[PDB]
Amino acid sequence: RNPVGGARVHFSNPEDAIEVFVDGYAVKVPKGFTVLQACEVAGVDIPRFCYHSRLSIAGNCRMCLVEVEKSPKPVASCAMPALPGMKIKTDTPIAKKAREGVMEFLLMNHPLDCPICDQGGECDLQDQSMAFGSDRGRFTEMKRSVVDKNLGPLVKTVMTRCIQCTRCVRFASEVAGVQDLGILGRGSGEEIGTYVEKLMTSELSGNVIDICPVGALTSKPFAFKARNWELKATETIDVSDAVG
Amino acid sequence: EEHLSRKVIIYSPARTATQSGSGKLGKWKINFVSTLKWENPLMGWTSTGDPYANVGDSALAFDSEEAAKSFAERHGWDYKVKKPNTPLLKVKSYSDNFKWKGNPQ
Amino acid sequence: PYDVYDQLDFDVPVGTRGDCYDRYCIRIEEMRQSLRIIVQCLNQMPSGMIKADDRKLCPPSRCRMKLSMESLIHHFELY
Amino acid sequence: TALNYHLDSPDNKPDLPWEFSEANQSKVKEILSYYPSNYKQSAVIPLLDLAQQQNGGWLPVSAMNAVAKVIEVAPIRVYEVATFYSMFNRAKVGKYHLLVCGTTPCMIRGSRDIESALLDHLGVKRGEVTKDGLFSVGEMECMGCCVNAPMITVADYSNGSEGYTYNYFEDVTPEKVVEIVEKLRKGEKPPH
Amino acid sequence: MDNQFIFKYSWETLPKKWVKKMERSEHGNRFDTNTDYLFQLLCFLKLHTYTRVQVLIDICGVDYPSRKRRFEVVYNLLSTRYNSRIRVQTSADEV
Amino acid sequence: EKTHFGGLKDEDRIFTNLYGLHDPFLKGAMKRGDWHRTKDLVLKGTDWIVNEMKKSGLRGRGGAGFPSGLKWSFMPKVSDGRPSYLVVNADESEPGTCKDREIMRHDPHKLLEGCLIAGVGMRASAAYIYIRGEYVNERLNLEKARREAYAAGLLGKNACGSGYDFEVYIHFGAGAYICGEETALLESLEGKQGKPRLKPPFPANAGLYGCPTTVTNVETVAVSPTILRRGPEWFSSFGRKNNAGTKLFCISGHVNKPCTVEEEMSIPLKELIERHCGGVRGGWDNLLAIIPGGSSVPLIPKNICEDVLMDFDALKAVQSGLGTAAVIVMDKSTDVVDAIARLSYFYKHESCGQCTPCREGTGWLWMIMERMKVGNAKLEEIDMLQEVTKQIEGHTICALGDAAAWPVQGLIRHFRPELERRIRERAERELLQA
Amino acid sequence: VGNHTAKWMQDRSKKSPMELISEVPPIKVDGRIVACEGDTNPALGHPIEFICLDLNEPAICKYCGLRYVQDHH
Amino acid sequence: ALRRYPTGEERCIACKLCEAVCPAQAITIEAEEREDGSRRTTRYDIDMTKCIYCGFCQEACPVDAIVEGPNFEFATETHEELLYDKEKLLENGDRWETEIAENLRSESLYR
Ligand SMILES: Cc1cc2nc3c(=O)[nH]c(=O)nc-3n(C[C@H](O)[C@H](O)[C@H](O)COP(=O)(O)O)c2cc1C
Ligand code: SF4
């Protein structure tokens, strides 16, 4: 099977490979790969929100739950190391129902503003709600709401849409090298912010727009200008410096 | 005749940066580099006189590089192939988030 | 047959000469039989939903799209 | 009215200087000595507790910046700690901070009978310091099984860090809680 | 005369070299023939007593640019005698 | 004996100062038997301390009931460069529990000696004691005892003359229930927010500062020296098989005399309530429900309380748990629906917010429970409430997500007709009034 | 009057929608949260929006532009 | 016709759903953030000569901003006048608001 996205796998030594089973099929992965990565090698696309391949593993969104043989609980595939002889099931009723329940929790307090949200049409939350949790909504109470924060002229903020995946916080501390974003508070009232008023001054700050899976962090100069489906994509390179 | 000598690019569109899902890759398209458009001076609508303005993205698709390459040379289009970039799956560990800093130096 | 045609009574008129005059008479009779079907459909019309309820190709109601996150997402995708 | 963000105010803004007092740098050193020198972040909670004692019972943002400098972390990491834990006050409280209105284990035994009496005597609402800046009323952290509920907590910041106390008072009635506030005003430590 | 009978009867009685592919499904029985046998197969289906495929409903092309024979010519046929439909397809290129 | 359990006599009580009638400091401790022949115990070696712990059948006193001897043997046998740490969980924020507070209040040297004994049995070089931030007096009491131990050579370099170097440090929290969780405790001790980690890695491999670490309860630690001196066979004589030892119980609520007491494991609940607490207020007859240990286990109805025994295994068999052995007793006059809705608020308020099912599910359970308190719901909403608990259970990072769903599931399982009656009455009033 | 409105509005006789929505005073709310439907009949309004009122500045509904403030604090 | 709220604010929030669904590609929209932060269109064009009067745009709109009104008598002497811009559509909504609101109330029980 072709790896998801044509992802290349490099082996330090063939002896340092283990065997795992993904929905019956057999795959060979390097030692140290996680269950999610073994799924990618087997050409199985596991839904995920908090996991990013270039950031440290968080394991908080719980959308990557899969069924592992001899395991009493659904396993967070993004974090669990794959083991020899592991039998991984990704479409059994336990896995499908776990995804449905988590998706219902994600949409519980999410604002009804797809028409005014720039993420619409390229939103992971819309797609995974269509595919995995196709559950009619039964939440009728009052949603929570959050005030917006000022992060500067580049990053537009609508924090009602935030799903507390902490990708932006981890990017600020592991890639940008500037620790300004954090997660403040506790419980359902935790908020992503800088606490004190301050703007994102890192030269890599605009990348939080790409990594935010929802429309919480969006491009301010691009705001409301177009929908993704009407845009033509050209693959080129940058000439701002000598990096290409 | 005149439209058969245009230069095209055979390429596999990469994954978008706003979504983590990979369910569009593996496709191969012929880019006709149709870059002659302007504004109609009554409403400002986007005008174009190129017949191949949108056919390369809407209807013409190929499941393989070879299939795309064979169709271009049968039609007489001079093409260039751009190989797609692919990610390198690297070993990750949740345990690495707690690595011991070591003895106070 | 398709839809509820197997639960309805109507006759099928056929010609005996194959000429323009036969086909004229057949269209008159088909109109009479069409009247017959409409009357039966009017009396047998049951209550219930008029859209299929699989939330994959059926647009949600205006009230749920404006009240439920799942319905608004489905409405966004379908249109 | 606890909020997970900071709005600048004349008495609460980063530019106001804030250091640990010289009598408190001795306590800071021993706190830092409990942990490996490359793991100074471990001392954030005892240092924030010490800083709040020195500042009369609350943590201005300059105090959180000072603690961040002591342990050499970005101040956002300290802000995360200060907002996560309920023992840290980020707004002014009185010299004696009174904690009432307990949780589940006590209200079975009628805990919600002391709060209204306390605001009535102090002539203030919850969260607001009195005009002399002596007394404030906040939510109570609940401990034990409340066999003797109703119960209130008194945090004493009247004498900096060397006179700090955090005590629980049992059998509190609308007439005992008035007696407690009177000895607190007079300076006598109420019994417990 | 259901789609099971036609599939089973055709396999037994048809010349073997005429059909390359046979699909039985609720989307329609479908014989894929080679270009040089299309005419004879349709003549067999029309004249044979147990098929009596008398009506040619329509002929349509489909373009598949990724295939070396890009065009697929689809013959939709009906037997009023037995109240059944059959699909016969063949591939072709531009020349 | 083998047939009936209870009536633990006064010469078999590990905590002889539980009532605090004697001096808790060093002089009173040696008089009671603390710091006695501790040099001999350390010189026995780590493999003997671990082995005697296993034979004693001591189980985890923090709620999970894991065999303590096996848990200590998880620690590395040869150091790989990293030091080993022992962390003592004194962060008891669980409602209705004060057993650990009493141990630190009246027997701090039992805890300190246990830290040294446990450290040797895990090859640990340093111990950290994490005290609840609200135990300000209790912390200062333990700190005074800790100075007494260091000054007397019982702790620090060459502890008790045994040649073993062991440091004891005291740390405190700042008011979070979640910090009682073992991995959340490690995160808090490192100076971060109290957010539990995923497992793997396990703390025995990568815990505090990413070093091998064992997080154990105060009760588990404070009983280890006494188990060593008097021998494991004496300890395993008490209680049923696989539920050996004594236990600190604390009974609260609607009992004639609430008290904290040390009793045999597997003592019948009824015997403990009537014989030690003067019985249920209004007679055993007036009993709606009992929450066996702490607010993190489902309640059990009056019929179940008749014969169930207070151990880990018996309470598991009736869809409950021993927990912290904090007994909460509710008579017929209590609104059980309001009682559960109160616990639902506690779990919504105490959720650390890290993972989706806990962060959003706990508040959803609370909102429904507030509506079911007054009947402002449909009959079908009871089934939905059960399904919401199942979406939280087993899908969260830590066990608080499980502890949030259990009281709601127990209410539906045992008191569904009480719920339905409220809903029917509310709709009955709705029809007539308007 | 603004550049955004001047793109499409060539008539200066009437006030622009931006000025009209700025004139309606903020709606006072007893509480820190309000739900806006944009209409007295929710089915004829916009998708429900929940608005936090923790800031001192008036909070704007992102659909219809109505503004809300806390009544007391 | 394009509609407004009773306060005078436009209903349209430039979601572009009507533009995406329109089977004739008769709708052209441009948008940007307004000076007060609002998400509003700066251009809304409907080619009445491309339009097939299907009502799909009205179905797609989530805020009842675009509607097909009851007017059918708008024949023109020039092709240009049938290129409706935003101002013309808002004029139509102002003129026909009382009838449109009445039809929407009557039809609300079916959609
Ligand atoms: C929400 C939560 C709170 C907890 N609180 C405590 C606690 O206060 N004290 C404790 O000893 N264990 C507590 N635990 C259990 C610990 O995670 C862990 O099992 C225990 O510290 C191990 O001690 P033991 O092996 O001696 O029983 C808690 C667990 C959870 C999920
Ligand atoms: S992020 Fe935006 S597009 Fe995605 S579901 Fe939320 S509101 Fe809709």
Ligand code: SF4
């Ligand atoms: S703002 Fe976006 S990236 Fe940051 S935590 Fe929220 S959802 Fe995740």
Ligand code: SF4
């Ligand atoms: S279950 Fe609750 S307390 Fe535990 S990690 Fe998840 S959100 Fe935090």
Ligand code: SF4
């Ligand atoms: S009625 Fe609306 S959707 Fe249909 S063609 Fe006209 S503008 Fe497009």
Ligand code: SF4
């Ligand atoms: S008219 Fe309606 S559907 Fe079209 S852009 Fe405006 S709000 Fe969206």
Ligand code: FES
């Ligand atoms: S992707 Fe694994 S928990 Fe979020």
Ligand code: FES
């Ligand atoms: S009133 Fe009982 S713990 Fe506060």
Ligand SMILES: [Zn+2]
């Ligand atoms: Zn509104």
